[PDB]
Amino acid sequence: AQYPKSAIYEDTKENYPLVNVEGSKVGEQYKALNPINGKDGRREIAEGWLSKKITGVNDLDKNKYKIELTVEGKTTVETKELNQPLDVVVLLDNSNSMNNERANNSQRALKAGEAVEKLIDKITSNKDNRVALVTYASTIFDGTEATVSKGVADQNGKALNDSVSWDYHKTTFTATTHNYSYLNLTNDANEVNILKSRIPKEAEHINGDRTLYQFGATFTQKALMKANEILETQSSNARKKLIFHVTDGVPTMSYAINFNPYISTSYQNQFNSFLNKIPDRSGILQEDFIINGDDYQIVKGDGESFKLFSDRKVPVTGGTTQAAYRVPQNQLSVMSNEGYAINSGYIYLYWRDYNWVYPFDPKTKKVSATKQIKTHGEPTTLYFNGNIRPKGYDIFTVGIGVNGDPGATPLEAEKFMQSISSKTENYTNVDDTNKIYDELNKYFKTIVEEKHSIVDGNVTDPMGEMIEFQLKNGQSFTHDDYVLVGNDGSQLKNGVALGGPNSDGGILKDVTVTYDKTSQTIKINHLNLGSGQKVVLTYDVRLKDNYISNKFYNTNNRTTLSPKSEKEPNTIRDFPIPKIRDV
Ligand SMILES: [Li+]
Ligand SMILES: [Mg+2]
């Protein structure tokens, strides 16, 4: 009437506690003992989990118990080139166009966001890999205060907001952005969950938060820059470096090329000079962009177009003539005094200079007589070639119904997106937002291989010395004498797997359960178990007649798993073993 508190694994020598089996009660004394906990009873091993426990007392007086045995496996990704850890930065477009309503409720932001979450999970299925996330639009959505410039101007470039929803003075906006970024590379399980909680699932509505709606354009350059900065300062050559970029549009903002109006050469020469600093002459160094300022003061574009404007006059919507702003009567006096160029109640509207074709002379406003930057793709591609291509990062780009709106042709747009990927084949434009994840997964598969932890594995379960395996007829082992089921709802029926999603036997296809009458050993053969694939074996046992009183007997001899019985026959994991006794 005394109990052993615990026993010992034969593969690692570490202890496992033995609890009491409740249903085995003979008034305040216990007849059987289970290992680990009184619940699921799992033992974690490098290939997954395994348990072996009495789940049922069949007949207490006669010592008849029901053993349950379970095996659950794992998956990882190992990187094809030389088990090298990855450092991965996801770039996610969260522009207004990504709103779930848009493109006939195509659910861009939701679907993209979920693709990213899935990819982040797969990536981090390898404890070693690291992830970081940058969500962007007019700026990086990282939970800090940001400013953007908006509006139009009169003929002397005095700025006004011409929208009837805003005061005319509202020509910059300032807001705290949503925190949709995680800007340190991390592999910490908790930090990764935080990172996942920051992946946007929606974008702004024009009549939702109208302020943040002003920050919903596409500044692809700032994002690319941020991915580069994270890798450059946080990664190493120890690690392989990947960038996945999910986007729904061509850039509509960009950093300016730092043309210099005060030196005496053609802007085309200044340009050729920027390029000549680079081995391949394909790009412009960071030092030659205007970066060191506040975005609203220095950037080009405001979300309006991929194009910068030759004609500085705002045209009428679907028309040719110059748009004009009817001044409200109660504001005529004030705008006049302020200095606006008012022509009999109306202000004629020009694009603000940040949207003009450039360079142009700061004094005379005259456009360059030579080189002209006419799009936001050009400078973005130049920055990319100049500062990112060199580093050799693998760069995949999944576009979502990219077509060039606003201001690019579909062809112009495909070229741009190719130009900001590692190879031409590293950009794919999907026509349907359910393919977003397939596409991200193809590319990732390029770099990694999925490996299930249990490949042709074997369980060996010999009965303990005082134990009788129960046979329904006392003589022959039959398929009626054990039950094997998989957590995908498949089962061995008469030694043939049936069930699971494809009516093919699932998880249990070609698995077999065999028995050796002599050694009294039950075996599971041919297990192939990935992540969250689990198999459960139940059978019946009886304690043999020749037993010694109040002495706990083991239910099995050494019970083991061989996770890969071909790939590493020597890898052998122990199962915990219950114990029983009677008088
Ligand atoms: Li039988
Ligand atoms: Mg967009």
Ligand 1: distance of its center to the CA of 513 in Å?
Answer: 14
CA distance 75 to 305: 45
Exposure class string for 226-236: b at 16+ Cβ within 10 A, else e? bbbebbeebbe
Q: Is 288 exposed, middle or buried (0-12, 13-18, 19+ CB in 10 A)?
A: buried
Distance from residue 460's CA to the centre of ligand 1 (Å)? 20
Measured from the alpha carbon of residue 138, the closest ligand is 2
Cα–chain-centroid distance for residue 106? 20
Method: X-ray
Residue 47: which of 11, 73, 10, 83 has the closest Cα?
Answer: 73
User: Two tokens at 510?
Assistant: 């070609």
Q: How far apart are CA 5 and CA 215, in angstroms?
A: 64
Q: DSSP state, 356?
A: B
131 with 88: CB under 8 angstroms?
Answer: yes
Read off the DSSP letter of residue 69: E
Cβ burial, residue 467 (10 Å; 0-12/13-18/19+): buried
Of 497, 467, 257, the closest CA to residue 377 belongs to 257
**Residue 564 CA to ligand 2 centre (angstroms):** 48
> In the block, which residue shows the tokens 């004009």?
324
Report the greatest alpha carbon distance in the chain.
Answer: 115
Q: Binding site annotation covers 247? A: no
138 appears as a binding residue in the annotation: no
Stated resolution in angstroms: 2.6
Which of 564, 559, 553, 556 is CA-nearest to residue 575? Answer: 559
Q: 39 - beta bridge partners?
A: none
Q: Say how many residues make up the chain.
A: 583
Q: At what angle do helices 377-387 and 220-234 cross, to 10 degrees?
A: 10
Separation of CA 285 and ligand 2 centre (Å) = 27
Q: What is the dihedral of CA 222, 96, 309, 386, to 10 degrees?
A: 20
Distances from the Cα of 47 to the Cαs of 14, 76, 94, 333, in angstroms?
18, 10, 39, 79
User: Phi, psi (5° rounding) for residue 437?
Assistant: -80, -35
Q: Is residue 375 a contact partner of residue 306, using CB atoms and an 8 Å limit?
A: yes
Q: CA–CA separation, 394 vs 240, rounded Å?
A: 8
Ligand nearest to the CA of 479: 1
Please check if 93 is assigned to a binding site: yes
Q: Is 181 annotated as a binding residue?
A: no
How far is the centre of ligand 2, averaged over its atoms, from the C-alpha of 131 (Å)? Answer: 24
Distance CA 358, CA 157 (A): 15
Contact present, 377 and 404 (Cβ < 8 Å) = no
Nearest ligand to the CA atom of 474: 1
C-alpha distances in angstroms, 64 versus 61, 451, 540?
8, 40, 7
Instruction: Please give, one letter per residue, the 3-state secondary structure of 312-353.
Output: CECECCCCCCECEEECCHHHHHHHHHHCCCEECCEEECECCH
* Residue 116: DSSP 8-state: H
Judge whether 218 is annotated as a binding position. Answer: yes
User: In 10 A of CB 320, how many CB atoms?
Assistant: 6
DSSP of 257-289: B---TTSSS-HHHHHHHHHHTSTTS-S--GGGB
Angle (CA) 556-561-562 rounded to 5° is 145
* 3-class state of residue 55 by DSSP: strand
How many angstroms separate the CA atoms of 340 and 332, rounded? 10
Indicate the burial class of 439 (C-beta count within 10 angstroms; 0-12, 13-18, 19 or more).
buried
Q: How far apart are CA 328 and CA 320, in angstroms?
A: 24
Cβ(285)–Cβ(407) below 8 Å: no
Ligand 2 centroid to Cα of residue 545, in Å, is 78
Task: Tell me, in angstroms, the distance from the centre of ligand 2 to residue 345's CA.
Answer: 36
Query: Ligand 2 centroid vs 232 CA: distance in angstroms?
Result: 27
Contact residues for 104 (Cβ-Cβ < 8 A; gap 6+): none
Point out the ligand nearest to the CA of residue 540. 1
Ligand nearest, relative to CA of residue 472: 1
The rounded Å distance from CA 466 to ligand 1 centre is 20
Tokens of 323: 């748009």
517's tokens: 């009458």
CA dihedral 476, 481, 485, 490 (to 10 degrees): 60
**Residues 294, 297, 299, 304, CA torsion sign:** positive
Contact 491, 498 (CB under 8 A): yes
For residue 507, give the nearest of 537, 522, 525, 487 by alpha carbon. Answer: 487
Reference 523, options 457, 576, 568; nearest CA is: 457
**Which domains, from first to last, does the chain contain?**
1-74+453-583 (2.60.40.2110), 75-452 (3.40.50.410)
Give CA–CA dist 257/236, Å, rounded.
29
Neighbours of ion ligand 2 (CB under 5 A): 95, 97, 248-249
The number of the ligand nearest the C-alpha atom of 480 reads 1
Closest CA to 157 of 361, 353, 315, 389: 353
Of 472, 573, 471, 477, residue with least CA distance to 527: 573
Q: Do 78 and 451 meet the contact criterion of CB atoms below 8 Å apart?
A: yes
